[PDB]
Specification:
2 copies of one chain form a homodimer. In chain A, strands 1-2-3-4 form a 4-stranded antiparallel β-sheet. Chain A folds into 2 domains: about 1-35, no CATH class; about 35-90, no CATH class. Chain A is an alpha+beta fold and about 90 residues long. Chain A contains 1 helix and 4 strands; from the N terminus they run H-E-E-E-E. At the A-B interface, helix 1, strand 2, strand 3 and strand 4 of A face helix 1, strand 2, strand 3 and strand 4 of B. It is classed as immune system. Keywords: immune system, 3D domain swap.
Chain lengths: ~90, ~90
Amino acid sequence: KGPACYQVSDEQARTFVKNDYLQRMKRWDNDVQLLGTEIPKITWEKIERSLTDVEDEKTLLVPFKAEGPDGKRMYYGMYHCEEGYVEYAN
Amino acid sequence: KGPACYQVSDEQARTFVKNDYLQRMKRWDNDVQLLGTEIPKITWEKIERSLTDVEDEKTLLVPFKAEGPDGKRMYYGMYHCEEGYVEYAN
């Protein structure tokens, strides 16, 4: 896991937040311009989750494809269930 | 906290991920079109963090303003340090 907040200086926090914000702006804008829509159609791919020791799962990996008139993109949402957020990969 | 993953069905997970993905596409695209750039200038506002019992902090709230040629927007990044992600509010 990352650092505890008390180990994170204001400067480190600002750097992390700026990196994250800029990267997000870039990524999401790019995906919109590529698909040609803000509201692509979503198609689902099979979810692989452990059939055993299921209480050990901290994350569900949900693959999907988004389709616009200009294009199509594959994603893997990794949904951290307890934290209530998703981070996306490709 | 949210549900444990073993309590989340494939359908619930897909619904959460679709909601999140669409909302993000919308939000970030909108912010880019509003600021008029993917790479706005970032200005910082003072960070308020507890001066006592600091080991209890799970999150740092980093306020900032983003400035494009077309506009300006206020944000509050809440940086969850250990998890290594930021969620944004306005």
